[PDB]
Amino acid sequence: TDLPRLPFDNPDIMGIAPQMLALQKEGPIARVGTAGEDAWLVTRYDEVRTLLADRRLRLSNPNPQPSAKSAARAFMVALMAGDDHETEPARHAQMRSLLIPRFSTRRLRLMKTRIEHHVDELLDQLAASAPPVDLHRVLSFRLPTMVVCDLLGVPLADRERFGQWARGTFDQSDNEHSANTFQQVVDYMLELVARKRVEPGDDILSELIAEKDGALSDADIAHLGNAVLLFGYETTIVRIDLGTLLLLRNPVQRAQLAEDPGLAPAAVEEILRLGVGGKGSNALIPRYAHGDITVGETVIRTGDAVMLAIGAANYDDRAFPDGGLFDLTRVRPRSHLAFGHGARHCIGRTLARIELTAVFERLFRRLPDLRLAVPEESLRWQEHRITGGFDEIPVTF
Numbered sequence: 001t002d003l004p005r006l007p008f009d010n011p012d013i014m015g016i017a018p019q020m021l022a023l024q025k026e027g028p029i030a031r032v033g034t035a036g037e038d039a040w041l042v043t044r045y046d047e048v049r050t051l052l053a054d055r056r057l058r059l060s061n062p063n064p065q066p067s068a069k070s071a072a073r074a075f076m077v078a079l080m081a082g083d084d085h086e087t088e089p090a091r092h093a094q095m096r097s098l099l100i101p102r103f104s105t106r107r108l109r110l111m112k113t114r115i116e117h118h119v120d121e122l123l124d125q126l127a128a129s130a131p132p133v134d135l136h137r138v139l140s141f142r143l144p145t146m147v148v149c150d151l152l153g154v155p156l157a158d159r160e161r162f163g164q165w166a167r168g169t170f171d172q173s174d175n176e177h178s179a180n181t182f183q184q185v186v187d188y189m190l191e192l193v194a195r196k197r198v199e200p201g202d203d204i205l206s207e208l209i210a211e212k213d214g215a216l217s218d219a220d221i222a223h224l225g226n227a228v229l230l231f232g233y234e235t236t237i238v239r240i241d242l243g244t245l246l247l248l249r250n251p252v253q254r255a256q257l258a259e260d261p262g263l264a265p266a267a268v269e270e271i272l273r274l275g276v277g278g279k280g281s282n283a284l285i286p287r288y289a290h291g292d293i294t295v296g297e298t299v300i301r302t303g304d305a306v307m308l309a310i311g312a313a314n315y316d317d318r319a320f321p322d323g324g325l326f327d328l329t330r331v332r333p334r335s336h337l338a339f340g341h342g343a344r345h346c347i348g349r350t351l352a353r354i355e356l357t358a359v360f361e362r363l364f365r366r367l368p369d370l371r372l373a374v375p376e377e378s379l380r381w382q383e384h385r386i387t388g389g390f391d392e393i394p395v396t397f
């Protein structure tokens with residue numbers, strides 16, 4: 001008897017840690033240690049999906065003495081309206097109600113055209129440069145930050161100011177750095193809201209200023225813009241880096257994609273499903289039980305912490321036959337859980353798919369000989385950041 005302790009070791013730079021797979025074959029739910037409180041870890045797809053849709057399972061902590069968390073996690077939960085369990089129902093409903101209409105078909109179609117031109121321009125630059133080139137810096141980071149600038153209605157150069165603020169806000173290793181970084185986001189957002197009040201445009205804060213005939217406080221609006229800035233680019237960057245690495249590992253599928261860019265949507269769903277980095281700590285959705293729940297034969301009691309392993313679930317043979325294999329031809333793939341599910345289902349997920357699709361429509365058709373310029377083993381997943389990610393992807397082509 002040995003209590004498994006998160007995070008588990010991963011000898012590979014991607015995938016699911018061996019011990020996590022071992023637990024998943026044993027059963028759907030396991031008691032594990034973590035950096036703080038012990039938690040139920042749910043590993044199989046069926047149970048993860050069902051509990052993500054169970055409203056007794058909430059982001060907010062209902063416990064009388066909530067355990068102290070990193071500043072990073074505290075900011076993340078606060079941005080998701082999860083910091084006060086008594087107000088979370090009304091606050092979270094308002095948050096989704098105000099943000100979902102910002103991702104309208106009209107905005108997404110215009111965004112798609114611009115995204116497509118931007119990738120073409122990014123790849124022409126990449127192709128004109130001399131190897132070795134950091135693909136992370138000149139492609140992965142640049143497209144999603146471009147998109148956030150357009151969402152917020154600010155010049156592209158602004159991403160040179162804010163492009164590391166998600167990383168800094170979500171650094172679990174340094175509470176002081178986390179708070180200084182978030183203070184910069186807050187300052188920047190408030191200045192931006194004040195300007196959109198007198199110089200609006202076709203962007204999301206202008207629409208929020210106009211919403212509820214302006215009943216929303218500037219702080220309400222800046223809060224929603226902080227969620228857009230801080231969630232709107234970093235994960236997409238990481239998925240671009242991860243998707244490149246997966247397609248380099250699977251040359252048969254990659255060549256198919258280069259030949260037929262109509263396979264890009266399929267590739268993108270496989271990228272999202274299999275794209276798990278390092279120890280995959282960001283592929284765990286955290287929740288607390290607000291009521292008793294029976295899972296398998298395990299009783300989750302009110303107040304317990306629950307780790308919902310969407311990465312492990314996405315690899316689950318029960319849902320995806322040979323779940324570890326990259327396959328563009330998965331007939332009618334069970335919807336992966338990489339955007340979550342249920343009440344907090346990712347709000348930017350159509351935008352992210354549009355971005356990823358534009359990228360992988362073009363990348364290996366524009367640079368078919370693109371390959372890693374360093375061994376895979378030299379790529380370092382940043383475990384201390386809630387959002388993880390690699391810091392550089394050296395490539396030749």
Ligand code: HEM
Pocket residue numbers: 059080096099227228231232233235236239285286337338339340341343344345346347348349351352
């Ligand atoms: C490939 C890129 C992305 C991935 C893998 C991803 C993943 C996720 C996941 C798993 C959740 C659920 C978290 C939970 O249930 O606790 C979530 C929530 C969220 N995401 Fe995405 N996301 C991505 C891109 C984006 C983009 C581009 C935006 C906005 C521009 C965005 C905005 C949000 C917001 C606001 C939430 C909170 C939803 C809520 O709590 O109600 N994300 N994301």
Ligand SMILES: CC1=C[C@@]23[C@H](C=C(C(=O)O)[C@@H]2COC(=O)[C@]32CO2)[C@@H]1C
Pocket residue numbers: 080231235282283284285286386387388
């Ligand atoms: C607001 C979010 C938190 C994430 C979710 C995806 C993430 C990621 O891919 O890094 C984050 C990591 O931390 C979490 O708790 C998540 C998984 O729930 C999403 C962007």
